[PDB]
Amino acid sequence: AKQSLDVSSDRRKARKAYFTAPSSQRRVLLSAPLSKELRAQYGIKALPIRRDDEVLVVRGSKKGQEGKISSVYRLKFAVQVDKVTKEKVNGASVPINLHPSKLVITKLHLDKDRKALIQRKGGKLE
């Protein structure tokens, strides 16, 4: 149960907030957990998913498939992985929209900012 008077339990307000959230909030909303090995290596549980990291699909019909994040389509709350597609006979290939909470990060794309994020979340890289 909530204890703050500044937090709302109203379903209508929560859903309006989710569906009108801007792009910077959608980045936080589209977080993904790390794998077991990465979790032990970095000491953190989940990160906001970004464009160049490698994932494992752990739910849905495409379960067990791996690949690199191709795009983070925040407008449609989805991510697209390069190896996870649907094909037609005329040669068409349509990316599968995957939700990042149904993925698992297996390799992180590290930069200065990402390292700072891990270290301020309590990571212990290298």
Next chain:
Amino acid sequence: ILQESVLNKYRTAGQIAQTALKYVTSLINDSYHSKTTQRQLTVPELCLLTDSFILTRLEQYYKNKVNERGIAIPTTIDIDQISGGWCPEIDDTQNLLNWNKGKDSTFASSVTGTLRPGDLVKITLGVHIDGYTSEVSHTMVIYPVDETKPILQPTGPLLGGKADAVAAAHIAMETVVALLACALTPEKLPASLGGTSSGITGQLIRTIVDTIARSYNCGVVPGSRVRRIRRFLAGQNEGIVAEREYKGVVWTESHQEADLLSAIPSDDFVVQSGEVYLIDLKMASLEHCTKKGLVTLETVDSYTGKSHKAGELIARPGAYVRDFAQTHILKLKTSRQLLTKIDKQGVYPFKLSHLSSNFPFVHENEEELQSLKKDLKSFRLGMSEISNNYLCVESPIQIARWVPWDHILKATNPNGNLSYDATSTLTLPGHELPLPKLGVSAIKLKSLMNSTKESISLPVARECNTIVLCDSSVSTTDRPELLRLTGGSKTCQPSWIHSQHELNPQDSIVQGIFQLATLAKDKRFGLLLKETQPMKQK
């Protein structure tokens, strides 16, 4: 059907083309290699003087006897990555400088018009008489001049991927000439290369050319062909105008896809006697390609606002093509007069400077050049309305580009076969499928090429000849022989190059090539290859 008169017309056109090519080679050597000339000639000046020399030589032959004669392919000079279509007008120099201000230095030779050491300069020109066409194209190399030596010679050979491309193109030209000459004496074809009772096929042509390109670590640029030439139908505009009947062998991105996996041209033909064949070969160096990729072409426009890319060339094509199936009465008098002159020209691609009454100039004068430019400004005014109503089209400027296969495989196209560029002016390349097996269209492939960061450009070398298969009756000496109308050891003499590759002799196709070279070098009991000689000038 061949005849003495047809053969004579082909011989005359070929001699004119050889003389023009020798003239431009001498001009390049005087401007950059001999360095005796005070002023260095630039590319548009070279093209203009070449066209004038061709017209003045052609005026003397077949007067009041032939309905149509003139320049078949306007003089084109291409540099390195630029694979064709570069015949700029003289009134576009300041335009090119202004357009390419703030760009890279990669196309500096073409932007400025001044050649630079190490450049692969490809010269292409063709002459038609009564619709009987002879075309020639030769790659040469620009070298720095030595100083210590008494005699002007290069400091060293051309080295690297450009040398690989030049060698591949030259050896492919020689081997194809020998193979097509073996069609007249089929019993002389080497046993391993093909059957003693078997003829020459486009399959054999393709596999020999591919073997040579693979040996020299080069690709075959998708514009290459070995086709048959008929009266008024020489493929003078192959990517623009369609043809009812086609007999020859082409290379495309589709052929590259099929090779990696293993009106429509097909290699299911036998080379027959008494025919004229054009062989045009472009070899692209794959020196900087550390992976396996696809060789394609990027088209040049005149819009500097279409992107922010630093290594992009901005230019406007100089050659136009008249579409005689389209009729529309223009509203400008200048436009109507220009259309009358364009219809006077013919079914060959033309330059606006070719349409001036002053051109060709009797005496190269400053006032003559000024009068030509004065005509040229009004010609541009008329040309804008002529092209706005689809009466003429531009023959494109193309750059050879390399796209790696992993990007194509990872890319997703939601439309597949159905996607096509509907804003394209020309129907033939607009409705194109470079990858029939993968369902990747031309517009999709252009998008992938532009999106790649590893899509680089490739230097290209070019060799193109015209040959006639003269029978026992048609030839002088009562034996069949191959008459090379243009090209050979007098005009298309190779530059000084050195390559680290060679054909590995442990291949049957390579052994057949070597046997063909032996039979060519034999002049008594082998192949008879009679080369057309340039006429004298001074």
